[PDB]
């Protein structure tokens, strides 16, 4: 077993050891390798060339930058199923996962991704089930960003942003999605058809965007949806005057910490909000932001009159 590592079968873990270099003598038989929470600032060229049996690799939480990710030439193996490069430096995409088509789990969270959003870099990853590109300084504009991800079930993309603060139809190929995190993306508007193909979606996180309205129409097709998180937006009205119901599958609607406008101008919307009581969570944290004389009051404890 390499120095400062723990070995079990073909698995090697060398985590939180303050390592500045990759341990020497890692055997070619290794199938899983974790070097997480260390101080690796660079990897010598072809350091992984002998690790041809690797199915799992995590380099999470180091100071690594990749001038050309990601390919079998970068990691030696062509049988990688799990790659975690989260909490690192700059990751530039020069190769579209050449030789890494077996990937099932991919994590880039809190690393600065470059040359990804303008292209369809995931085109070959027909087996990918989990993708995390949260907080990657990604500006979404090109609609084909996720082309190829037919099998995807979990998509986390929190802490990014969209051209024109607009959510386009970027999920149309992702029919197997069960979890979608779009929180903290500065969103203000969405395509009415953005979620129409997502019949298996169970959790949709829209928390801490910049929406001023809430409607039921974009969620009409979401007949597997259980949790809808709209906390921390600026919701005070709806596009449509006549709001319907959310899908019957829905169990939780989070509207806490929205800047509700408790005025006669929004009597109808607020009445509809009251009627969603059985869906709502922590109702004490649903408070009026305006007008001044009602600021801080729980929305459900108010009867607005004109
Ligand atoms: C927010 O509003 C609700 C409902 O609004 C109704 O309030 C009543 C008083 C009336 O003006 C009506 O036109 C409104 O639509 C308030 O809930 C109601 O509270 C009153 C007073 O406690 C209840 O009245 C009582 O009714 C029973 C018979 O049902 C009588 O025996 C009593 O004498 C008494 O009059 C009424 O039942 C409540 N409504 C129901 C059934 O939930 C609520 O208090 C109010 N909140 C505030 C303070 O803003
Ligand atoms: C708005 O309200 C919803 C519903 O109460 C909150 O959703 C909750 O979010 C947390 C954190 O994501 C979930 O906890 C997670 O649970 C799974 C196990 O199911 C576990 O693997 C994770 O480690 C984590 O603990 C929780 O399940 C979820 N609640 C429900 C009922 O779905 C949400 O946090 C609220 N939003 C904000 C910003 O407060
Ligand atoms: C989407 O998910 C479903 C599972 O709900 C996949 O369908 C299964 O596919 C396997 C073969 O890999 C079959 O053995 C199962 O019988 C299928 N389940 C049923 C009953 O439909 C489907 O392949 C996934 N789609 C993609 C493109 O990955
Ligand atoms: C939606 O995303 C937000 C973050 O954008 C989640 O809220 C955070 O939850 C974690 C627990 O995993 C806490 O450590 C943070 O303090 C929370 N942050 C905020 C914004 O208060 C939220 O849990 C997500 N919702 C769902 C349903 O998963």
The percent range for helix content is under 10%
Radius of gyration, whole Å:
23 Å
User: Roughly what fraction of the amino acids lie in strands?
Assistant: 15-25%
Bound molecules: a molecule of 4 linked components (NAG-NAG-BMA-FUL), a molecule of 3 linked components (NAG-NAG-BMA), a molecule of 2 linked components (NAG-NAG)
Distance N to C terminus: 75 Å
Give the CATH H-level superfamily: Ribonuclease Inhibitor
Count of the separate structural domains: 1
Widest sheet, order of strands: 1-2-3-4-6-8-10-12-15-17-18-19
Query: How would a textbook summarize the main sheet?
Result: 12 strands, mixed
Specify the overall morphology.
Answer: elongated
Give, in order, the helices and strands.
Answer: EEEEEHEEEEEEEEEEEEEEEHE
> What is the CATH class?
Alpha Beta
Number of helices: 2
* CATH level 3 topology: Leucine-rich repeat, LRR (right-handed beta-alpha superhelix)
**Class computed from helices, strands and strand pairing:** mainly beta
- Strand tally: 21
Task: Please state the second-level CATH architecture.
Answer: Alpha-Beta Horseshoe
């Amino acid at each position: 077993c390499p120095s400062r590592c723990s070995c079990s079968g073909t698995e090697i873990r060398c985590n939180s050891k303050g390592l500045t270099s990759v341990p020497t003598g890692i055997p070619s038989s290794a199938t899983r390798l974790e070097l997480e929470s260390n101080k690796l600032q660079s990897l010598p060229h072809g350091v992984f060339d002998k690790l041809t049996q690797l199915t799992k690799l995590s380099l999470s939480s180091n100071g690594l930058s990749f001038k050309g990710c990601c390919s079998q030439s970068d990691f030696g193996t062509t049988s990688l199923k799990y790659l975690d490069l989260s909490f690192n430096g700059v990751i530039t995409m020069s190769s579209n996962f050449l030789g890494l088509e077996q990937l099932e789990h991919l994590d880039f969270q809190h690393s600065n991704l470059k040359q990804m959003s303008e292209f369809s870099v995931f085109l070959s990853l027909r087996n990918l089930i989990y993708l995390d590109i949260s907080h990657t300084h990604t500006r979404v504009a090109f609609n084909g960003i996720f082309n190829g991800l037919s099998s995807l079930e979990v998509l986390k993309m929190a802490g990014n942003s969209f051209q024109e603060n607009f959510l386009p139809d970027i999920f149309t190929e992702l029919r197997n999605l069960t979890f979608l995190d779009l929180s903290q993306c500065q969103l203000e508007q969405l395509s009415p058809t953005a979620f129409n193909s997502l019949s298996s979606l169970q959790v949709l996180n829209m928390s801490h965007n910049n929406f001023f309205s809430l409607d039921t129409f974009p969620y009409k097709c979401l007949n597997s949806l259980q949790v809808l998180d709209y906390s921390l937006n600026h919701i005070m009205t709806s596009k449509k005057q006549e709001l319907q119901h959310f899908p019957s599958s829905l169990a939780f609607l989070n509207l806490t910490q929205n800047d509700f406008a408790c005025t006669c101008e929004h009597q109808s919307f607020l009445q509809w909000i009251k009627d969603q009581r059985q869906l709502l969570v922590e109702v004490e944290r649903m408070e009026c932001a305006t007008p001044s004389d009602k600021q801080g009051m729980p929305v459900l404890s108010l009867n607005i009159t004109c």
